[PDB]
Ligand binder design. Sequence first.
Ligand SMILES: [Zn+2]
Lengths: 1089, 115, 57
Amino acid sequence: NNSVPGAPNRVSFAKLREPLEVPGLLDVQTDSFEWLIGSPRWRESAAERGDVNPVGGLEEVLYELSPIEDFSGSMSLSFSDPRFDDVKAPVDECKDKDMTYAAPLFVTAEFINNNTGEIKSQTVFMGDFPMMTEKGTFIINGTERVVVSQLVRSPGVYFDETIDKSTDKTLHSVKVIPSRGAWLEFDVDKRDTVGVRIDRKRRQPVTVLLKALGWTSEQIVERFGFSEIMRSTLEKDNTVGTDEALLDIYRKLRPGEPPTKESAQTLLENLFFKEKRYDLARVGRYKVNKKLGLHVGEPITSSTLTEEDVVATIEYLVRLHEGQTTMTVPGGVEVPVETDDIDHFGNRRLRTVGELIQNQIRVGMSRMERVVRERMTTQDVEAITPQTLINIRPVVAAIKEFFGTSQLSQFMDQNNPLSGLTHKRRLSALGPGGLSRERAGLEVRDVHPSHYGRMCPIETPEGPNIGLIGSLSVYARVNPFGFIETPYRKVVDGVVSDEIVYLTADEEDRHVVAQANSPIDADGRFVEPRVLVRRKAGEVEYVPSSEVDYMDVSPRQMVSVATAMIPFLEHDDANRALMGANMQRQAVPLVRSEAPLVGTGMELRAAIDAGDVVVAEESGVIEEVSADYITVMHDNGTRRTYRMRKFARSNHGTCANQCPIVDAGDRVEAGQVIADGPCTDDGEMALGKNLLVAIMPWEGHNYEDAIILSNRLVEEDVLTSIHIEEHEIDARDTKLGAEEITRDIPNISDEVLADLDERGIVRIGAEVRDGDILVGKVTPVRDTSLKVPHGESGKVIGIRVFSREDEDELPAGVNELVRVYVAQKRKISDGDKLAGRHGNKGVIGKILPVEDMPFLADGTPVDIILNTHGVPRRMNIGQILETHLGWCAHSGWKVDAAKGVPDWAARLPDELLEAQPNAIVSTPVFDGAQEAELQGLLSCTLPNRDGDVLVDADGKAMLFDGRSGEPFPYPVTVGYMYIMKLHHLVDDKIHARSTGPYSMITQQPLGGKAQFGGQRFGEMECWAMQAYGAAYTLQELLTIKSDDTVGRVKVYEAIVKGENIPEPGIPESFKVLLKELQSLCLNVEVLSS
Amino acid sequence: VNFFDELRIGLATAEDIRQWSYGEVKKPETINYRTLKPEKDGLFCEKIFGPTRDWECYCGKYKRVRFKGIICERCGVEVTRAKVRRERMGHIELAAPVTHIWYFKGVPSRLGYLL
Amino acid sequence: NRNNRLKRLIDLGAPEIIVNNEKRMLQESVDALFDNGRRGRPVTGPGNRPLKSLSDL
Ligand SMILES: [Zn+2]
């Protein structure tokens, strides 16, 4: 069932079949933009889904705007039908040449003059559009970009309820939150004053505004006769009269203005019926209609609030106050009456990139149309042309600044493909248009029983931004409105249905959802009469096997993408699982990757959709292959070539390559991987290696999370990585002259510049050491050449120089910007982080020689030793099972079957009973090998080539100490466990500073490793020094090593000689404080006496 | 050197400020926008505070290193390290006496209670 | 600027009203310099942003 053509074969501990393949993992990101621009594929998909009206994004935004007109009604303009064009240049050059992947858009505008009756229609250029590449990213100025979705509360109506502490009576509050306009709050109080708060005003009785519209008092009485408290309020109100009511409403809204009937009559429709001033998104209108069951049969076209909505809302509020369960309105079917909840996924919508870009271009269009209408009103009416009207600067500027500074435009972290996919799939909750950190409540950061199937509960950043950043579920797909969905198969009469449907939160609540893991017969019959189930909210209880209506699809329907590939996830703890999931997004691509021996079946699929691996489009036969390019011949006679970038700096400092895995003369089928990118092995993810682990405390070197590594890893490049630095210098013009890069440089010995070439740059392939010169330039002449920072080294792989003479776009005011790439090969050393997939971090405490590590009975030294005291306290026992299964798979097994399948081997797939050495196995999450399976397997491992079996049935083995040479008294556990490598290397951290450049404005040493600056000295250190009673040390730290210039010079000279250190002087801070306080006329004396 | 038995804040007076400063600013012009140099008696004139560079007379008459404490008659500046620029002040002369904002507005207003 | 204007104006000569107005302007300038926003509308040049007076150090 390997959907991809030629993926590696790895039998799995499969017990249940999923009736649908995982949907395209990036379809969520691309569908939004596809809808926004508008393409035939999106139109066909929308028609398939059944939506009556196919409407694009650009067309919608710039059609709801037109037709613009002047107040005199003598002029009008319209322009619709936006269409796009081809590309400027391919993506490779756009990223390398510093350009921006875009394309032009043309809108056909029609220019109509009312009083005359003429039409002026022709195409118009409207700037460029940052098109989306096929991997769901935006290339801006050569730097990758990825916009993250956002969570917002859908505009609608929410019926809140607060219980009074004194009255102990229910207060039902209803608040409407439209896209833009006034906010209405109808609250029944102890005093019974059912009033309104329009724009945070005083609570004015609802009857006042109800009559203000002219609502007949008799209709108030009859329609509210069932209501008692509201009838009392009606009898209690004093002011009566349509004119009086509307005038009072206007005074409450706008007091101090001429009170007239026309003013209030116009303001009513302007604040509630002028669509431009008061607007709600179609999602809001649809959700409100569903809430009240009013206007259900028609497709929403008018997006304004209506009076019947308000009257139905107040009726609903009063009925709820009476305590009724369900309410009905004429023309509306029966619906329940209950309070709404903020943290329900039937209310919190999801605004993809489409909504954000549409809003930004809408703002741009508003800014453009204001000036356009003013210009047409003022400009000559005879020879006016739309070309002269439309101004393109505002929209382009708006999109550019949105891409530049908007917080929703983050650089796509690219440590490895998994990180990129997770970042593309992220679900943010903060940023512009959202709540802040201090104002956001703590409850929102907690789970909600409606999260199951939509947002993973495990994956989350560890920092303070916990609960505000989730991730789509595996099978979740956004509905055309923005409400996440989730697949289900509906049980009709107790028989499972293969056909599936997608249900949103509201419909999910209103039905009965079964359990995927519940046993089901092959014929679709429920073997059990009682099957557990999930109910309205936090309710689970057995029910007969007939009334059950819906059943899930697969057990892995609530995990994120990253968490879906952590074997034995059903055994770890929540915190440990979250830590492991977060760790998996920090691996570093190695030089020679290897696929894991034990891993879920969601590895190859997560790699193909990751985009970082090429794949053939049509089934052809390869003619020839090369390390730099490939040429595949299609069956129709069309030759095609793919170019693979080799050693190009990743967006985060790591390296990226591609090595084709195909041979010359093979008929490669369509969809078959052709090249493996970083962290890949035969078209499947591989973030780490396989090491032979042992669990025992060893001479305290592995004390408290430390780790010990055999030197075999160091000397075999098992964990050797490549990191590529990047530097650039520029020669920008100045008032005093223009700087030029030149080989010559004043007063420098020939040896120093022995590397620079004739043009003034270092030749390619020349070793560079810290403090060396990397590119020379002269400043009108002084020396300001660029030099390698403190703590860098390696080869020089390539130099890019951009020249204005060759017609290369450069930032304004520059002539020659040159960037140099330095690549260094790092071998794993002491002080480096390592961590498995179960979230057990550590540091390399010591790297013993290969001749010192413990070795198996047959002479196979182990490669890494883990502590044991940290396993049961942290309670991550899953890794022990992973180690056992890894050893079992590595050594190969053969279960006895001559006498028959053992009872413990009943459910094993018939093809999983006979394996080979270095076999591959996969345990899907929540459905994998049980403890009995491991017990049976460990008793049938194939013997070593020497004829003997090393490990026992339990999994432990007899070792031999390398130092003493005598065996340990007790057996120890061993096995192969997958080990990654984190990005927190040691070379970055280590740094020293004795004497160096001093800041000029503060007279303090610089900061940061790159600048070669000293460390910070917090006030807590001052408190600690004071506690010890140490005075002279504090005096030195505060005076002689930070501020006093003459003090520093004198102490350095004395140290250089044999003289005693002279006593410190007056710090610069105190003298500055004096010379500053003396400026406020406060004569600050010293009184040395 | 580093002996501070006490510290007392005294209320200054016009003559005290006259004594403190080394110049009399007269123009608001900042560093020149063309030659990037201070203007005559401007807000950065070397004739008030000191030389922009170290051991450098404004006209170059006494730019040699072996010049310390020698005021140049040609350009009217002193020859010392650029640090001295940070340790000298200037005083503006007022054509009309004023009040100290910290007193007639402070709570309690010292002027109000005293007067 | 205000002080140099006061000097030039007194050199040129004028009745009491204008000179007193200029003196008040100078007083306000000095008060703002010693502290901005201490009383009245604080001075704001860019983006209606209050400026950091001497006392803010
Ligand atoms: Zn001179």
